[PDB]
Structures are given as structure tokens and as C-alpha cells.
């Protein structure tokens, strides 16, 4: 029931990043070289298992998991984590633990953009992608 995400997406606004990096506690370097790139995320499906690819010219990741299964994730910052994904209200939600910590990576197609929304803390970053043909 995830198919209008599925597909190439590049990403083409930025709001708050920083801030939600500095409240995992991502060091100033990478933030800074993260403030400046322009990731593209690649989301694909095989029967009920999704894989979702982020490439960029600094950090590359790729999970693959079942929607409300949870699996473990070593984020692009390091962090080991228990996740799951599952559809609410139409929106994919990741959410990840880890120390008793969490955050959730909200993403939701409005006007056919992918909006991501980061939250972590007080920390709210709107990511936004756009699809590529
Ligand atoms: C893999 C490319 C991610 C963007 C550049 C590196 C950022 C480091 C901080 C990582 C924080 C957790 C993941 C954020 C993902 C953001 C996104 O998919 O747009």
C-alpha cells in the first residue's frame, strides 16, 4: 500500500537539518559538509519487503525491511538502532530507539512531493524531494 513513494527522489529543500543533526550530536564538520548535500533516495519494492537507498557524494546507506517488522539500522551517523516503518494515515513513519532515545522520520507525498519530516528532541527538519522520470 506504498506505491505512489516508490521511485527516485532528489532533494530539493532543506529546513532545519542542522539543527536536527546537532541534537543526534553530529559533529560540526559533517553537518557543515551535510548542509550542502543533496541526497538521492531510491525507494523500491519486492513483495512486501521495502528498500529504501540514500546516495549522496558523502554518505551512501540502504536499508531493506517488511513494513511493521522492526529491524536493525546503522544510521548514516553511526547510530545502532531498532526500527520499524509502517503506513498511518497515509504517511510512511520510521521510528528508531536506541539509549531509550528515538526519532522518527516522517515521509508523506503532498502535491506529488515527497515531504520528509526529521524529529528528534525539540528538533523538527522538513526535507523536501522531488521525483525524477
Ligand atoms: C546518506 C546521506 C544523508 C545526508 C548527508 C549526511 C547526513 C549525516 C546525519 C544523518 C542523520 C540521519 C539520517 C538523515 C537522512 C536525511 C535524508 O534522507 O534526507
Request: hydrophobic fraction near 35%; include cysteine.
Amino acid at each position: 500500500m506504498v506505491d505512489a513513494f516508490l521511485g527516485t527522489w532528489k532533494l530539493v529543500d532543506s529546513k532545519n537539518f542542522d539543527d536536527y543533526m546537532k541534537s543526534l550530536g553530529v559533529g560540526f564538520a559533517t553537518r557543515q559538509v551535510a548542509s550542502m548535500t543533496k541526497p538521492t533516495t531510491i525507494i523500491e519494492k519486492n513483495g512486501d519487503i521495502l528498500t529504501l537507498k540514500t546516495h549522496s557524494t558523502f554518505k551512501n546507506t540502504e536499508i531493506s525491511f517488511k513494513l511493521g517488522v522492526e529491524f536493525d539500522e546503522t544510521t548514516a551517523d553511526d547510530r545502532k538502532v531498532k526500527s520499524i516503518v509502517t503506513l498511518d494515515g497515509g504517511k510512511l513513519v520510521h521510528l528508531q530507539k536506541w539509549d531509550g532515545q528515538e526519532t522518527t522520520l516522517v515521509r508523506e507525498l503532498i502535491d506529488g512531493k515527497l515531504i520528509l519530516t526529521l524529529t528528534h528532541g525539540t528538533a523538527v527538519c522538513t526535507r523536501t524531494y522531488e521525483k525524477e522520470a
